[PDB]
Amino acid sequence: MDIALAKRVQKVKPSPTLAVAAKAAQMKAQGLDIIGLGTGEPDFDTPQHIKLAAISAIEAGDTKYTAVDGIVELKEAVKNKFKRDNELDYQLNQILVSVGGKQSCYNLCQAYLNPGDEVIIPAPYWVSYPDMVLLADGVPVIIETTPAQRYKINAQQLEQAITPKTRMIFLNSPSNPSGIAYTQNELKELGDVLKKHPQILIATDDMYEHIIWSQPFTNILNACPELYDRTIVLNGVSKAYAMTGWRIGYAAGPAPLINAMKTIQSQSTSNPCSIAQRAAVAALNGSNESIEEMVNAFHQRHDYVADRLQSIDGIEVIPADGTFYIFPSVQAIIEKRGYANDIEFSEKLLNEVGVALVPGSAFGTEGCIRISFATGIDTLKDALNRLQRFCS
């Protein structure tokens, strides 16, 4: 009598960042004093001129289907953003507007990956990279890194993991969860390895491109232009303009790949919310001021948090270059107390002092925790006080 389900969903698990978020929302909605230091979104509202454009779009009758791959105003804005921000040249047939940055990745895997294809994924990785590979029947090949490398892979590791079967790699810099960015010198060394394997497609996820303070943002294509013809660039307005719930991402890459991704999209979501596309145009075509103000605040919150974590015995802290995440290791605490792993550390801490985090093993790096400083410094000081009490 029991309904049998698709073998492909048994291979993955539901988003565990989103499960921590939903655990804490529901505990909060039941009256409990919980603090969700595992946020995926800033504490700023969408800037006012983006709102007025979405409102104004609703009043004009922009409530219809559009080109599946995005209205021309949006694709133009994207084209000009890649020229003016990243000195990359893309035609409009190389651009695809999608329903969040996550879908861009999902379309890429469905559009490109065949059963058994191996995808190099550096750990610590964004939770969804292996699940999106697995849903397309690819094989995640994880490269584990340590604080002794500031959580960045190196050329001999990469060459070691590459195989005749490997057909894609994800490079995510600035990284969710670590907050670390590859310098240009370092990206050059990785491109050198990659130019020797022409069958490998390079997916650079630049979603945190503007949330960076230790250096100006660079990506693999600035470092090694030679790889242009086999790189998809993935990006979005989610984090740079606090438009998380608007669900607008975008991508640029080789025309045949973009057309295939568009094929998957026309058969799953068709076009994104047309009101949200209009909002996105206002964002990309607007001034970066609300960015600079947001990023300055994230930076001062980051320094506050990193220094708080430094004062807690048993916590080894690696400072981020960007994003609103920091990824310290609680391994010393796990060992002295006898917990199985960072999951138990996370469950105990939630249950004892009400701080909800994402355990590092959800990202492939056991013994760490992911802390988001995308909330106000008052929430931060409270939560870190609670984490300090727990670690005593």
Next chain:
Amino acid sequence: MDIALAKRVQKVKPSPTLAVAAKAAQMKAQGLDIIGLGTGEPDFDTPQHIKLAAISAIEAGDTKYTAVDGIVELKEAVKNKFKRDNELDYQLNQILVSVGGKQSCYNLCQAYLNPGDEVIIPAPYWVSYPDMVLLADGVPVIIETTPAQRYKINAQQLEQAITPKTRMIFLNSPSNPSGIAYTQNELKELGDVLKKHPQILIATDDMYEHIIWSQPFTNILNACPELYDRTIVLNGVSKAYAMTGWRIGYAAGPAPLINAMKTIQSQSTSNPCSIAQRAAVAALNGSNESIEEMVNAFHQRHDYVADRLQSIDGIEVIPADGTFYIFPSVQAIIEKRGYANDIEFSEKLLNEVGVALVPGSAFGTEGCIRISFATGIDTLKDALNRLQRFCS
């Protein structure tokens, strides 16, 4: 030099509804005198109370991540809409809000179907049914119907199509492209066959449920409530409330299937645009004044269009029960003028008098065309004058 693309994407060919829409848009954009008769979307704005609710959600800052399967106000409004409209009972863990009703269908295939699984699809079909089945490596099993059977399958056809590997059926009533609705009598005769094959999931697509005039709407569960355990109901607001651009659909069925579909969604789009969800809450909880207003206009247009198509020699026409489509056969003309098929008929009609419509072959019924009367009652009088001048 060239990027190789995934085998699954080679199984699907571009949508013919999307290609007619885009080709007519270039022809109007160059200045030719084109009338579009192949839109899949009403010519009404989104009603004011929905628009107001969305604007107010923008100003209120509901611009962040929600629960992946939808805000609880919208899930409750779906629960009550199913109880109120269709006398079906569903709990919140049986309901999933998706990025358009197309995504509900896509999530369903990815969550349910295993490679080799056969899915029964009555012809004429919505053009996306077989593509979505193939993208999940399932195998479409078309039941072909004739204008004489009013383009409906009978019990004998459904029994002869079922095999050990039949796992799903799509029942789309009222139908895109035909406009025909099954009666409760005919559905029960179908449910009686399905009762003898418990392994078949039933996917009833009721997106056009309110766009009906020939009879009260009923679906397979009003006909055979016993099938409740193995039926998922797909719906949405795109067609009833003129909200295609908003990208909100919803589904109700068995909790373990709804949860796998949620898993797929959590790894592809996350939650749909939070602004659209509030707009959807206003639509479902609102009055039905917009719909009755829209639907009677469509009834008036259909009746005019149908009366017209009878008077044209060589055209046989079956009147519609609803939707904004009519699906008449031009086969007598293809023979007479020696055309290859409805495709050559459709390019020649668009070349000669600039009427854009969709050939019946795209929905799997050679020799018909889909006319859509979701345009002005004035524009329709002209479209149909051009149609004699082509056919007479």
